[PDB]
Amino acid sequence: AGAAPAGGEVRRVTMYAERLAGGQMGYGLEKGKASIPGPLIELNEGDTLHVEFENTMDVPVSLHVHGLDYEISSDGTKQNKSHVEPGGTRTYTWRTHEPGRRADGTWRAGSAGYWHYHDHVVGTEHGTGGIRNGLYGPVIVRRKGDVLPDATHTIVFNDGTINNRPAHTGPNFEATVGDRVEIVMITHGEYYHTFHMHGHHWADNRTGMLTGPDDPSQVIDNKICGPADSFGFQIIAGEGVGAGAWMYHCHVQSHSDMGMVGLFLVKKPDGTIPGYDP
Amino acid sequence: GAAPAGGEVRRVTMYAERLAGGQMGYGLEKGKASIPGPLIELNEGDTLHVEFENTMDVPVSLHVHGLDYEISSDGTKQNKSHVEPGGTRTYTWRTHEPGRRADGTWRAGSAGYWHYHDHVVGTEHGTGGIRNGLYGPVIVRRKGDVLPDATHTIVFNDGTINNRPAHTGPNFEATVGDRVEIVMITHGEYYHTFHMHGHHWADNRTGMLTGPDDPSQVIDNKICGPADSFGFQIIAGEGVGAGAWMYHCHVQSHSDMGMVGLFLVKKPDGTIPGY
Amino acid sequence: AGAAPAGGEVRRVTMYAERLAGGQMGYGLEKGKASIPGPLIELNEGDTLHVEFENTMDVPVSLHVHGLDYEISSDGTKQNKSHVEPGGTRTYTWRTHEPGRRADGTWRAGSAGYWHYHDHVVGTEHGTGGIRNGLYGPVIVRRKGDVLPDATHTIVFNDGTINNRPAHTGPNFEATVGDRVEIVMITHGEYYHTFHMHGHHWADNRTGMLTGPDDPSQVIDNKICGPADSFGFQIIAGEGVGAGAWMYHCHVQSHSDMGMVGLFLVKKPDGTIPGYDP
Ligand SMILES: [Cu+2]
Ligand SMILES: [Cu+2]
Ligand SMILES: [Cu+2]
Ligand SMILES: [Cu+2]
Ligand SMILES: [Cu+2]
Ligand SMILES: [Cu+2]
Ligand SMILES: [Cu+2]
Ligand SMILES: [Cu+2]
Ligand SMILES: [Cu+2]
Ligand SMILES: [Cu+2]
Ligand SMILES: [Cu+2]
After folding, report:
1. Which residues bind Cu(2+) 1 (chains A, C) (predicted)?
2. Where are the alpha helices (H) located in chain C, listed in sequence order?
């Protein structure tokens, strides 16, 4: 229960790229704790982030980010010699800005939104191998006053997997009726997808909720997405529909049949989920 | 005509039936199933009880997008909310108006262009049921929405329009000046792009800009994937006049192989120049 | 540069459809100077354009435009005999209109937007051959008061090529830090794509810029698009990021690996590009 403050802090974090089991690779904030997706990075508009990056891996790796402000030296491409050699370290810097009126009279959009970072050098100079291996994660940049959620869950459609998981293994997320639940939805790889949530719905705009009665944004429960698309939203769990095992899945039929499905488990306050019997 | 405030409790019967050629369809009366299924129209606030009967020999279900439904009306075998052969079940859809929540945020209303479809035939995601034709449109209107003269539903289902054989339309007729509503739904395996000659719409809830402050892009071509639904109203012939106005998927092999139809816009005298 | 005036002029131009080398086909405003993409057409809402069209080729050809007001005789399809026979001429007329209140109290959208024209009869009755061969070009319709760019660049994803160019050959576009640069981005053919620009971002609305602090449009740097989609935007070159070779590419991973890539070369005021060697 709260809102994002105004930003402008200089922030620091250590990040590592590490091999994981089965040919996978992940980003982590502590050694041996790499995850797919990588760790959620949250900033308020105006914040600067210095990522003190370490490549623990035996092959080059990079960190490229969407939406945020970065100089070429933090592009994270071989083009710009801003990759990281094996065993090497590098500080990537991401800046963000508030919205404001330009001198030419136009309005400059702020950095706020649902973004993501990923590798750009593993396998190919566009990171095809590193992204396939799991080198991706979410970045939320919040505008002053944006509503904060009770929990945030990241769902990545990477080719024919969710979060590089084996088919038919979710992931599942739990909430209680009334929780404000934030979804970060990212796509990667070769395929288009359509993200669908049973029992819930959001506005197709920056925050996923209408700004008020004048917001003409479409309200949807199904959204087409392709490689490197990112969007997000906040829903009220069970709003107008109640507790239950609410499925979410890609709606491309073969993709849902092959396992691109998971559960949003919404509990009443007493913890019950009517009719859930897996 | 403009939509009123909703709030009524409404009722329909619906049946799932086998149709010719391994197809299956929904209908509001027995032996009268259609593909797409019947158009369901509600005002925000309405409740709909669908007294549903599975007349076929395989399980079927009814799952809806966008509307408010309890988990018992999800329409999946996972919840045992499917309908066994010969069975019946009442699925209930509710709808709500927009309004501010107690937490201070704005809750969107139910209004928009939605759809219902099977979730259990062939697979536990309805792949065979959707392929066979078990889909239909639902429109929920907001108080004050302008009402159209006609509503036409165009479903891109895999490589087909409305499960029709290639190059068989469908076509739709209007008169210049008619306010025509299009419901545009996609199902199956493929992405598509919907395109209309001679006409354009806003990429927002209603397909019409709300006024001069609406920044929505105006378009005549829209990418869509399985279970996407959108809709819009056009003034037939507005700024362009009468004629056989093509619509089609703009994916080139799809338009070449048959996902094309005609919006046949008539002069007042009933004729179409150039057709 | 400034702002678009109110429209309402009646304009005329010659257009030719011509064969080019390698089995290609292009539109041009001067005989012998066709190009792929075709010439940029720019109109202010309310303007009329009479295109005096000549088919110099040995196959029937047409001119079909998106978004604009055209009568059935300027549809440019075989079904109403508005194609152009080999050697023939025809006047295609495009009209446009301002937004306005209808007498019924509803709001009529204006013609403004990022549009395109292309063939509709070469090879198939949907122009599959003509489009593949290069018969496509951009149309911009501006609203009174739209900000004018310093330059406009057109990027067409046509099947697996950019602008029918051999793979890995760009195109590249040059700008100086602070330039107001306009991108028109058109897709054609068989495939879906995702368009991504490093170092830059835009608003997913008509103009690509937020109208002000009440515009809830998502700000993005990645956008899914399919055959005959058109969108555009304006960016301030290097805004918040500095000079550099800023890659743009399809983000479908194999497409970026197969050469659907180019460079937005943003130069320092001294004309140099840091970290880039030509
Ligand atoms: Cu890139
Ligand atoms: Cu998918
Ligand atoms: Cu659903
Ligand atoms: Cu990327
Ligand atoms: Cu489902
Ligand atoms: Cu298609
Ligand atoms: Cu067209
Ligand atoms: Cu569905
Ligand atoms: Cu066409
Ligand atoms: Cu591509
Ligand atoms: Cu077209």
Report:
1. 64, 66, 118, 251
2. 128-133, 253-257
